[PDB]
A paper describes a structure:
A third structure is of the heterodimeric activated state from human, which was allowed to fully autocleave before crystallization. The overall structure of the enzyme does not change significantly after autocleavage (1.1 Å r.m.s.d.), but there are conformational changes at the junction between the α- and β-subunits. First, residues 141 and 142 at the C terminus of the newly created α-subunit become disordered. Second, the last turn of the C-terminal helix-α5 of the α-subunit (residues 135 to 140) bends “away” from the enzyme by roughly 60°. The channel is composed of a constellation of mainly hydrophobic residues, presumably to accommodate the ceramide acyl chains, while directing the scissile amide bond towards the active site. In addition to uncovering the substrate-binding site upon autocleavage, the concomitant conformational change to the α-β junction causes strand-β3 containing Cys 143 to shift. This moves Cys 143 away from Arg 159 breaking their putative hydrogen bond, suggesting that for substrate cleavage Arg 159 may not act as the general base. The tightly bound water, W1, from the proenzyme is no longer present, as it would clash with Cys 143 and presumably is no longer required because the active site is now accessible to the outside environment. The active structure of human-aCDase allowed us to map these mutations to rationalize their potential effects.
Author numbering:
A (entry chain D), C (entry chain B): 143 to 395
B (entry chain C), D (entry chain A): 28 to 140
The structure:
């Protein structure tokens, strides 16, 4: 998956993400697709969470999955979750949970708790940085003001890095895929480098829903695992998700 | 890789399967009732995934005996989840006729990978 | 190895460390010692690095090793280095070095460059945090004022954590052994926990060269791998190193 | 563990092998000459480590063939180090009669682990 928080010349924030998931069950050799990826598409839904007939937050989720992987709180902040892989992170947390240590939160529930009950970009940022979790993860958070964008690379009990926008320094966007920024990607897929190349070619002046969707439609940023694309604007309050296809020729992931 | 794509928005063409439908979840309802409406509409599709998981599980080990363990032993093994998730998932299991252990496995797939 | 930076009630800093090293060559079944550890003792030397008959920095080193693992700059700061292990960190950096990418510094030389040419606690801290290195490491830094103590957990190209003294919170010391603070130790030895137990029993008011040496003389903090113990006080300018022995009964590491 | 030690300082007793001697390194000298004085005193002991390292290497692989490679191939393979380290280590190799490749291996043992 790819998560991008971008800042136009006007300091306006755009948060876009591609949801890639579904190799677990294998490959459909009949039409060149991933089994789960195709099955996750008809399950994808937009969700309007309301309290007292008023929207609290909106999200993109899979029916039956009560945690939130893509969402925003209109006028406040936007949050997307990217998978982070470790040698043995996920299962040590489950183990301590079964053996009775329950002071850590599941990743899907934490982002749900933040979108539901967090009232600010810093409150979410502070909670996303400090809360113990059962598995490593990436948190990509955008705010309601300029400069409020960051990637939080998490360990189960520590925040290894918080990478923030610095428009003065020339950092008008933050990109996060599935490998630590200071390390290297596992494969050729390397969706991060082309994502930055296309973000660069667009330039800060032209970043928009149109140019952001252009970035997330370029292979390998778009790939066979891409279930949907989401575009978010916190201050405007617009949140839209589109199912995607990558017809041959394309790339697996 | 590929040249950065131009003029792709608004979405159309072969890379846009379709739009995503909207549903409203009213948090004022108890957790056990929040997903009732949506799960009624989407229960069949979710069963397609489970059926496909049984077929793949069958290769390594017979799927039946595996699913007995997931459905019978996993809920007790993990214990209770904090609210509203435990009741939210219990409601999803009841409406869809999908065992709780499979609904749980779906909801913690990240930790499971 | 164990590194401790402590702060007394009067804000005075004490920096002590135990240099543990020498399993590589095996165990002497004749007198229950590590081969290298015993051979490193008669090679240990205190070094007074002078420029124009003026002391720049003093260090404890092994004759023939031009990098610095234990040292201080009188009146400015004190630096100790602890080994950090990773799945494949050390050799990926050497490999890129052989293929011509020389934008990273060797760990022993970096600490030497800091002790030799850094003029303040912040300059060293800033360099130790930001400088690219060929292998992961822990940097334990003490300053010439109260509150100037930190542990820098390093990746080859990133600083994963900087753990600082907080008199507000009650953090009058920082301890670093050979495992990341937010994780768990590899073995039973767990020299960190006894160090904190003994540091705690001493209490902030009584921390000194005498009580610090008490902490570093308690098993397993003192062990068979312990070549020498160092006690440092930056403002006073006192720097002492003592070769150690752990007679049976003791522990391997 | 053990009860926290009391009254161990100043150092004495069975856990205090001895004091550490002081040496002065004059940075005004060229790098090749800084360690000459100290290495004259400590060359024999450092050779003890090398001999002890050769014997253990001998088990897995003949030590000779390994050290030909280390002494002959490693310096050129790694290239030059930034000053003063390359000249400081070159000086240590000449004074101690220890090949440069072994002096280098000693100074990068951390990266080697
Ligand atoms: C490639 O071929 C596979 C099948 O060989 C396609 O998977 C099928 O995709 C459709 C729509 O994406 C799914 O339709 C659903 O059917 C269930 C009942 O089976 C219904 O309740 C839902 O409302 C929906 O109509 C279908 O389940 C699914 N089949 C399987 C086995 O997963 C896939 O879509 C094809 N992809 C392309 C790009 O052609
Ligand atoms: C356990 O036994 C080993 C040997 O069986 C001891 O290692 C020896 O340690 C002494 C110093 O403590 C070394 O002596 C040195 O000799 C060189 C010349 O050979 C001289 O230049 C030095 O100044 C020093 O006198 C000796 O080399 C070393 N032997 C080996 C094989 O490493 C070890 O110290 C014993 N430990 C205990 C606690 O008894
Ligand atoms: C949000 O509000 C309170 C906690 O402050 C609690 O009643 C409710 O369960 C919370 N929701 C979640 C998902 O934690
Ligand atoms: C922006 O968010 C802050 C909290 O981070 C909040 O106090 C403020 O009211 C918000 N302003 C707008 C215009 O959304
Ligand atoms: C993007 O542009 C920046 C200029 O600020 C440059 O440093 C970076 O290397 C570029 N990345 C790509 C992938 O073009
Ligand atoms: C310290 O002084 C200068 C850099 O300012 C340089 O000539 C010298 O090599 C430096 N020493 C080290 C060990 O980097
Ligand atoms: C401490 O470090 C500062 C760095 O600015 C220096 O000015 C000062 O002389 C040093 N010594 C003391 C005792 O503060």
């Amino acid at each position: 998956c790819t998560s991008i928080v971008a800042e136009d010349k006007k300091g306006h924030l755009i948060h876009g993400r591609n949801m890639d998931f579904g190799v677990f069950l294998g490959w459909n050799i009949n039409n060149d697709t991933w089994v789960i990826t195709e099955q996750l598409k008809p399950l994808t839904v937009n969700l309007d969470f309301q309290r007292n007939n008023k929207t609290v937050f909106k999200a993109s989720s899979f029916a039956g999955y009560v945690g939130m992987l893509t969402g925003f709180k209109p006028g406040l902040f936007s949050l997307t979750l990217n998978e982070r892989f470790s040698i043995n992170g996920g299962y040590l947390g489950i183990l301590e949970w079964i053996l009775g240590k329950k002071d850590a939160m599941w990743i899907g529930f934490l982002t749900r708790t933040v979108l539901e009950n967090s009232t600010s970009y810093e409150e979410a940022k502070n909670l996303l940085t400090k809360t113990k979790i059962l598995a490593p993860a990436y948190f990509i958070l955008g705010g309601n003001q300029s400069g409020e964008g960051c990637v939080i690379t998490r360990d189960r009990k520590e925040s290894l890095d918080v990478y923030e926008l610095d428009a003065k320094q020339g950092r008008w966007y933050v990109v996060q895929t599935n490998y630590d920024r200071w390390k290297h990607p596992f494969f050729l897929d390397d969706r991060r480098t082309p994502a930055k190349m296309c973000l660069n070619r667009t330039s800060q002046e032209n970043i928009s829903f149109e140019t952001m969707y252009d970035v997330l439609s370029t292979k390998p940023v778009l790939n066979k695992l891409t279930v949907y694309t989401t575009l978010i604007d916190v201050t405007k309050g617009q949140f839209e998700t589109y199912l995607r296809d990558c017809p041959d020729p394309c790339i697996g992931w | 890789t590929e040249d950065c794509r131009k003029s792709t928005y608004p979405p159309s063409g072969p890379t846009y399967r379709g739009a995503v439908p909207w549903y409203t979840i009213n948090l004022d309802l108890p957790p056990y009732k929040r997903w009732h409406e949506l799960m009624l509409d989407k229960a069949p599709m979710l069963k397609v995934i489970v059926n496909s998981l049984k077929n793949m599980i069958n290769t390594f080990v017979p799927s039946g005996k595996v699913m007995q363990v997931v459905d019978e032993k996993l809920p007790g093994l993990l214990g209770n989840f904090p609210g509203p998730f435990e009741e939210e998932m219990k409601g999803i299991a009841a409406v869809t006729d999908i065992p709780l252990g499979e609904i749980i496995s779906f909801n913690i797939f990240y930790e499971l990978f």
